[PDB]
RNA sequence: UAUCUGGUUGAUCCUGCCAGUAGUCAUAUGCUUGUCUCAAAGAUUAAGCCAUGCAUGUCUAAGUAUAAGCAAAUACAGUGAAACUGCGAAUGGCUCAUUAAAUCAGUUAUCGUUUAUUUGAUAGUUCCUCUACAUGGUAUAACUGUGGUAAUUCUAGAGCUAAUACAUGCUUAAAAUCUCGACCCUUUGGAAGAGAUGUAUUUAUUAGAUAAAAAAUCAAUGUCUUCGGACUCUUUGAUGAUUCAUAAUAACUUUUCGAAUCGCAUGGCCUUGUGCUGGCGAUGGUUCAUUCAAAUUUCUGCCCUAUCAACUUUCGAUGGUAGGAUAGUGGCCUACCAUGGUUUCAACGGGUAACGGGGAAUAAGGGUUCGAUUCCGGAGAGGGAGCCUGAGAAACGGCUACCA
RNA sequence: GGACUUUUACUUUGAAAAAAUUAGAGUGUUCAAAGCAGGCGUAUUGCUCGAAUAUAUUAGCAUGGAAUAAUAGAAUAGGACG
RNA sequence: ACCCACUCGGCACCUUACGAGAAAUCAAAGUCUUUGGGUUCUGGGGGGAGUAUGGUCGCAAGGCUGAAACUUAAAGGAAUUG
């Protein structure tokens, strides 16, 4: 099929190379799967060895991850809203590495007030030693709180989707998080 | 070509077997194994052109599946099977014991030990590293893998498994003086002592060997088997001891020999 | 090759898998990793307080100097962050047994922790193919005239 | 090299076109007959076994 | 192992080329042909065309036997067609058309990857805060009978039945540590009982230290002294080098693996029950290492041509960022942004009646010429392209399409 | 274990260097082209040698030498040593 | 201005061969079978042929670069003798 050979490419003196063979297979590309939003359609892909690639086709509830807190917690996806390589996969929704996207931020909300207690965006008296240990860290970042009011996270997909399956990612947060929305607003 | 080679073209040999030129156009290619097939010795080439008990390639395979030759212990099938260097290969039948080591021309020699010594065989550590779940490991230089050992050993020195679980008794360090065995090169089966390690980041390190007529010579360090302490080997060391005679002082050595 | 603003592209530049706690506040700012090529060759001091990225460094950045090392002076340096080297030597031809120049070019690639025009003998090393003909990376720096 | 390529099969199929066009007269099916004779040299000898 | 001689040359001397002479692991052809050892052979022209036959199939005690097969243990048990399953068919053999930094040679690299197989290690955790495990379920081939086609290694519908086929599915120690907490009794607080903790995948985070030594600080502040507060031996492997090996935490997964298999023997224990327990192997299985490989890669080297001086970027040309794709690096592809990259040290274009090399002939030395061909490497199976199966194939004694 | 440690060419020695082919050692294939065989005994359950060595001028790696041939350094001292 | 002596740099002349050449002759055509100071260009038997073809410069006349097929045993140069 498609082949990623360097041989059919022009040499560094602007030579033309003369084919000197056909196309092998351990030399093969196969066509990229877009990643859509929706129902869950995983496709198996066998691989050299015979292993397997799990394309995505259509992917949703992928996990995320709050990167200070430490924690990880299955979400949905609301849609893209960045992408840094090509304009039009924001366009159509399409879910790569590296894209910016927008999670529910429920699972988040809700872990917070279990784990230290506090309400954002406003008895079992074991649990209050819970909470109190923990006080006195339950101050986070003035932008994300601000989010969890929305309802709405922004995060970035650290996974390949075309080739595990699964979407997987991280919330953005801190100076990188001062970077995107400074693109959001200049550029989008 | 699609897919690994099957065949050996006599004459794509490796020299030290000492095949004739003619009489068939194929050579027998060890399968894989222990060893890498241009070091080892399969047990086709052993029983029937250097002990010349076997005589046709069917007598060879009804010497093995009759289940008679035990390869470190344990009972092989294969004609083609890369029996190499230390192992420790019995015949149960005669009572024979043999180690295969190399001669100091640098083919492998036929040396008959006892019942002792039979029982064990060195093996020179090439990589130590931590397994799943934390345990370490090393690798010895026929492929046999050993949990557990001691902390001490590191890469480039000899352990002494036994035959028959592994368990590393103990083990020879890395430093000058220790009796080395050369396992590649041009110094193929010679016998000295360490003098020096010139150690070269990059790659290639070179050792400085003194044998015991004081000639000195140079081999890269992958070529390097130490076998023990100066003088007192773990060992029986072939006929000749790996003392590299030249083609002149062979020649009076022979002369000693023929009348009477 | 020169100084510029770190966040120019299109996407956040960092270093991956290295993360700075928005949480705790250390007099020490940002988290930098580095390490050092081995063989021999001391980290610049660029690389270790610098700001910049560069994931081919082999200071500060995800490749290694494994293989050849090499010599030549830069010819050109008019390439985003790479330069182009000439070696030069003489090949002998047996029958007339005299020798005759040749010259090849390496495209090599310049982390921004080396300050290099033309002149300049730099040592290059093996540096795992990173762009279709760059295969050597800029270790050491020696100067043409002063 | 491609019209020394193209001149060399042009020659060599005008060539087989005239080795088959010369051997139409005996493709024996219909319109063929080649004429044997069988002649031999000595009186103790039968033409017919 | 080192010799020359004739044409020109008419009397002489030289430049000069031709002819003679000898070798050929160099081809043809003519004449002639007794003996022994040894042996190349449709390469050159047409990588042009193919009648016919063969060239890849395979079973041990150890996957499946109700052959209405043969021959002598009441489930079978000996030999054994057919067929299902597994494995092989990707090796060998042939040819040299293509191919001019390509192949190839020697030397490096994978801290940039895949690996059936052999060799060595490697699995007390599965359902569960009410259950088939002295063992779950279907389909079918072979076979029986009925048919179609002129024909083919064509097959349809109908009835049967097995697995190491396919699809499900469970036993097994105690301890430890974390979250959640019946809480109570009043604290410098400490507590019943609920869950979780294999492996594989994916993401995020942490540890992975170590140039020699002296105090004042507060916060988390612990075992003990004499509650003044004193305070220690503290665990850390390898490389030249790592965000390495490995481990820990939070989760994720159309949940990967964790034996429903087979042969040869009848051992031991008593509570003497068809109780318990147990030997020697065979085939499978996850990960790691190893071996046989493979894919890319570093430096240097190739014949003739200037009647080829500028070439490469339309249609990636050189670099950067990000993604996709791959077994994996990489303009390999895509989006954007730079304007580069090679060359008189011959780039680029052209020719090769060019596969490269080990090597061959020729011998005073250096050289000249040759290498289709017994070994190594590359490529192709009439021309192109596309792909299934599998560890491995862009396979042609595999398939599909187009052309001839 | 830290560092200053000019940059080369040249030449010696060595390592890693497929077999076959070439030179060459041993060996009465009946001699030889070859081949890697064989030889000696009480020829009654045997003994035993051998299957060497060299050549490869390029490129890469290691080391000895420092003539020959290049290269750099203190002239605004912005130079060295404590 | 002329004479004598020396010197540097010139255009040349005469004798000779220590040498060189096929010879005429040569202080360079020497220091070359006892063959290497540095470096540019050109030639490789005669006709076909400075022809054909392409490129280039020229208003043009032309110039520069420049083959092969085929055929041939010659093509020459130096000195004397009848």
Known sequence: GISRDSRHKRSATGAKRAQFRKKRKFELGRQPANTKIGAKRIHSVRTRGGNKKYRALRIETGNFSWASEGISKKTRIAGVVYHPSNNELVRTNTLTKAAIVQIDATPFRQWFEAHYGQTLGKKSKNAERKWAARAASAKIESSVESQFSAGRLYACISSRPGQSGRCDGYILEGEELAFYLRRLTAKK | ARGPKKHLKRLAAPHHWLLDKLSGCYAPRPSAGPHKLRESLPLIVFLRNRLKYALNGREVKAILMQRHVKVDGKVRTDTTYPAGFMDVITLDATNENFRLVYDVKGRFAVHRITDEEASYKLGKVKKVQLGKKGVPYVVTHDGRTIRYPDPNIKVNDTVKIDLASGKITDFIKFDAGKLVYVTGGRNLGRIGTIVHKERHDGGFDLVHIKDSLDNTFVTRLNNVFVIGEQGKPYISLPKGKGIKLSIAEERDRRRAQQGL | ?146 | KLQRKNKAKQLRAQRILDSIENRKLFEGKNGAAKIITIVPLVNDLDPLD
């Open chain 3, 1 to 146: 090759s020169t100084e510029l603003t770190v966040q120019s592209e299109r996407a956040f530049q960092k270093q991956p898998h290295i993360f700075n706690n928005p949480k705790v506040k250390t007099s020490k700012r940002t988290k930098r990793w580095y390490k050092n090529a081995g063989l021999g060759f001391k980290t610049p001091k660029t690389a270790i307080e610098g700001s910049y990225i560069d994931k081919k460094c082999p200071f500060t950045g995800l490749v290694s100097i494994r293989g050849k090392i090499l010599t030549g002076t830069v010819v050109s340096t008019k390439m985003h962050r790479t330069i182009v080297i000439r070696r030069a030597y003489l090949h002998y031809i047996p029958k007339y047994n005299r020798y005759e120049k040749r010259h090849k070019n390496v495209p090599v690639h310049v982390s921004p922790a080396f300050r290099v025009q033309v002149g300049d003998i730099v040592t290059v090393g093996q540096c795992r193919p990173i762009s279709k003909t760059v295969r050597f990376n800029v270790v050491k720096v020696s100067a043409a005239a002063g």
